[PDB]
Amino acid sequence: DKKSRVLIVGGTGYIGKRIVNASISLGHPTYVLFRPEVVSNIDKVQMLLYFKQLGAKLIEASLDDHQRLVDALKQVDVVISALAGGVLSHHILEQLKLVEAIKEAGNIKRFLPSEFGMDPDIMEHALQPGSITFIDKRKVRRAIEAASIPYTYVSSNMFAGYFAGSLAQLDGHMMPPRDKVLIYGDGNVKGIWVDEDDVGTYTIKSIDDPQTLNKTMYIRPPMNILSQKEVIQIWERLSEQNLDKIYISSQDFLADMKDKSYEEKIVRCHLYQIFFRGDLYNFEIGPNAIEATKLYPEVKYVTMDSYLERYV
Amino acid sequence: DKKSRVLIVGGTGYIGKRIVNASISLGHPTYVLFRPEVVSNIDKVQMLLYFKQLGAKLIEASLDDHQRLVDALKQVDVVISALAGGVLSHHILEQLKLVEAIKEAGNIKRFLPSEFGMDPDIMEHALQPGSITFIDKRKVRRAIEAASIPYTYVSSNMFAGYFAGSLAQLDGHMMPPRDKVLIYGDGNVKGIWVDEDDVGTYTIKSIDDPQTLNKTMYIRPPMNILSQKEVIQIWERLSEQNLDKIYISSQDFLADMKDKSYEEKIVRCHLYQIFFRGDLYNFEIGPNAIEATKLYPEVKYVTMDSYLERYV
């Protein structure tokens, strides 16, 4: 359908590839800035080549070369950053350089940061260490608005192939497990679960909208505002097997976690903000925000029934 | 010096160990705080039991636990943080949790934080990203100060084994080269290179002395304000023989620094700021502030002549 010029930086990553094919399939002339890490990464490269035999343009650029970054950005309207990796620190704060490069140029009509999760300044009163992610992304958010860039913060919640795959288990397997399932407390506390393609499709549809201007865009697809136990229940209904439930709680689980060291207590206490303090649905949308599914009613969201209807 | 009970945070890191020996040697009931480094390291645990053996008393407690910390601290009178890692600069902003316990238990008569290098208050103008060291440590200093916690900030410059022992090279090899060497700029700019065990002494003679209360002690040894070409002469032109030399420029050598990884850009920004901008010695020290060597006559510091004849 539309002609806007998007630059995706971060686009060899996990949600980035979803954003990238969304651009191309919803009519955007897409450009993908990539780093140097063509160095031994055949995987990253063949995907770029894959992106390129679809019609994308590839920009060799690094983030440190400020003058090429501005050159590059002058060629496009929107810039989407899907820049993320490990500790969610070393690579989220690189985007500051990209804000500095956007301030300097003037032709960007919209900048969408490396969000795609919980929403950093919705309190995130959060248990440490993994409180850093929301700290980092705020520095980036507060610097965008300072320099009065046009933004849309795409707070999109849980990717289904990360939490409904695993069924949210502490072991990191990306498959729903036979026999047991650990539940967090009650497992009644509501969560939101979204197909990685519905997140890309909804961010390329925010892109040029007057309505998503300086507003936070929540994807809260009505059908997928589900508790932990109810996603376990779609598996049960699907695999045709009833698992053996255990359930677990706050206190020495949080000091356990606070002694199992970083990256392990970052994923825990995030998973503990999702299914205990309930930071996915425990709040208002109201005035400086919107919902992705209300706005684009025509878009097609996948339910956790249809998403799990392939994990088996 | 003499019988104040020191608690030592970061007591198994590079300079940390050094302050523990000194603590013990100078007659203080040494109390070594340690996280679960149990979890990980054999050599850290054997190091601790060495302290234990030598005279010290061990307190295992995280920085995440306020109960253990406040109470562990009520035993002592002086805390001394030497919280290491450069990648572990999260460990500077770890001392934020600790200060909120150093005040919450009162009692402490002199807290001196994880300093031991360049003075960050020398309103660092420091290059991005290495300034993002001085930021974290300027956050603590202000926290000690508003919180009306007493202090002594030890600024001690370059640890000799890490700078004289390297001849401040950049390939990483922690011994002085036999063949090739990179000289920064022209290599005439000044550094103060101190020995790690006098860092420890001069630190410990500073904790109960009415001149260091709430000031910055610098350690500027006279026989050790030298430049890189000058500690390189000492290496060859006295102790080895002769290095084929090469001069790197301020310019596209700041670009050399430009394409590397976040923790490499930092060391470079710190090098490329002692040897180039001159920051160890391009300033006016004083007039309420003090100097270790001058203040503590009795200690016969170790020269860069004596230190590198250990490398021969």
| DSSP codes, B26-48 | TT--EEEEE-S-SSS-HHHHHHH
Q: Maximum Cα–Cα distance for chain A, whole Å?
A: 59
CB contacts, 8 Å: B64 with chain A:
128, 258
Element (H, E) at A31: strand A30-33
What technique solved it? X-ray
Is A286 near chain B, with CB under 8 Å? no
8 Å CB contact between A51 and A85? no
What distance in Å separates the CA atoms of residue A92 and residue A87, rounded to the nearest whole number?
9
For chain B, residues classed under CATH 3.90.25.10 are 156-195+219-283+297-312
Q: How far apart are CA B149 and CA B109, in angstroms?
A: 8
Which residues, in sequence order, are CB contacts of B190 under 8 Å at separation 6+? B225, B226, B227, B278, B280, B281, B282
Give the residue on B whose Cα is nearest the Cα of A65.
Answer: B258
CA dihedral B105→A130→A10→A41, nearest 10 degrees, is 100
Listed by number, the residues of chain B in 24-43 with a beta carbon closer than 8 Å to a beta carbon of chain A are 36, 39
Cβ within 8 Å of residue B56, ≥6 positions away = B20, B23, B24, B30, B31, B32
Q: At what angle do helices B16-25 and B196-204 cross, to 10 degrees?
A: 50
Which of B107, B114, B11, B18 minimizes the C-alpha distance to B58? Answer: B11
Sequence-separated (6 or more) residues with CB below 8 Å from residue B127: B254, B269, B272, B273
What does this entry list as its resolution, in Å? 2.5
Distance, in Å, from the CA atom of A195 to the CA atom of B109, rounded to the nearest integer, reads 57
Query: What element of type H or E holds A79?
Result: strand A78-81
Closest alpha carbon within chain A to B63: A258
DSSP β-ladder status, A190-194 and A158-159:
parallel
Which residues 204-263 on chain A approach chain B with CB closer than 8 angstroms? 255, 258-259, 261
In angstroms, rounded to a whole number, what is the distance separating the alpha carbons of residues A144 and A156?
19
Nearest to B309 by CA among B236, B217, B226, B202: B236
Question: How many degrees, rounded to 5, is the angle at CA B310 between CA B305 and CA B312?
Answer: 95
* Chain mean position to CA B243: 29
Alpha-carbon distance values, B268 to B89, B161, B249, B262, B273 (Å): 16, 17, 13, 10, 8
A184's tokens: 């967090």
Q: Tokens representing B143?
A: 């926290």
Q: Is A62 in the B-facing interface, judged by CB distances under 8 Å?
A: yes
Q: After which residues is chain A broken (C to N over 2.5 A)?
A: none
In this structure, the strands spanning B78-81 and B6-9 are parallel
| 3-state SS class at A253 | helix
Report yes or no: A27 and A2 within 8 Å, Cβ to Cβ: yes
Would you state the CATH architecture of domain A1-155+196-218+284-296? Answer: 3-Layer(aba) Sandwich (3.40)
Cβ-Cβ contacts under 8 Å, A62 against chain B: 259
Chain A contact set for B62 (CB, 8 A): 258-259
Nearest to B218 by CA among B275, B166, B158: B158
Put simply, the answer to whether A261 touches B39 (Cβ < 8 Å) is yes
Catalytic pick among B2, B97, B137, B215? B137
Which residues of A are known binding-site members? Answer: 10-16, 35, 44, 141, 270
Q: Which active-site residues of A does the annotation give? A: 137
According to DSSP, residue A151 is labeled B
CB-nearest to B259 from A64, A90, A132 is A64
Which segments of A147-250 does DSSP mark as H helices, in order? Answer: 160-163, 196-206, 228-235
> What is the location of CATH 3.40.50.720 in chain A?
1-155+196-218+284-296
Please say whether the beta carbons of A192 and A160 come within 8 A: no
Name the 3-class secondary structure at B241.
coil
Mark yes or no for CB contact A128/B64 under 8 Å: yes
Q: Report the alpha-carbon distance of residue A114 to residue A137 in Å, rounded.
A: 7
The DSSP 8-state label assigned to residue A62 in this structure reads -
Determine the straight-line distance between the first and last CA of chain B, rounded to whole angstroms. Answer: 34
- Which residue from A minimizes the CA distance to B38? A259
B137 is catalytic: yes
Q: Which residues contact B193 (CB under 8 A, 6 or more apart)?
A: B157, B158, B160, B163, B164, B224, B226, B231, B304, B307
Give the best residue of A66, A254, A261 to mutate against chain B (max B CB count within 10 A).
A261
SS3 per residue for B107-162: CCCCEECCCCCCCCCCCCCCCCCCHHHHHHHHHHHHHHHHCCCCECEEECCEEHHH
Alpha helices in B205-301 (DSSP H): 228-234, 251-258, 262-271, 292-295
Taking the C-alpha atoms of B65, B133, B194 and B44 in order, what is their torsion angle to the nearest 10 degrees? 40
Query: Measured between CB atoms, which of A62, A258, A261 is closest to B259?
Result: A62
Cα four-point dihedral sign A300, A304, A306, A312: positive
3-state SS track over A233-252:
HHHHHHHHCCCEECCECCHH
Q: Are A117 and A44 in contact (CB under 8 A)?
A: no
Token reading at A23: 């651009």
Helices marked H in B55-109: 66-73, 95-102
In angstroms, rounded to a whole number, what is the distance separating the alpha carbons of residues B182 and B260? 18
Question: Inter-axis angle of helices B42-54 and B16-25, to 10 degrees?
Answer: 10
The residue type of B125 is H
In our burial notation (b when 16+ CB lie closer than 10 A, e otherwise), range B97-134 reads ebbebbbebeebebbbbbbbbbbbebebebbebbbbbb
CA distance A53 to B124: 48
Per DSSP, helices labelled H in chain A are: 16-25, 42-52, 66-73, 95-104, 132-146, 160-163, 196-206, 228-235, 251-257, 264-267, 271-274, 292-295, 304-308
Residue type, B89: S
**A156-195+219-283+297-312 domain in CATH 3.40.50.1700?**
no
**Cα B24–chain centre separation:** 19
Structure tokens at B184: 């920064």
Q: What residues of chain A lie within 8 A of the CB of B258, using their CB?
A: 64-65
Q: Which residues of A touch B65 (CB under 8 A)?
A: 255, 258
Hey, are the CB atoms on A258 and B64 less than 8 Å from each other?
Answer: yes
In this structure, what token pair is assigned to residue B2?
Answer: 């003499």
Burial class (CB in 10 A: 0-12, 13-18, 19+), A199: buried
Kind plus residue range of the DSSP H or E element containing B51: helix B42-54
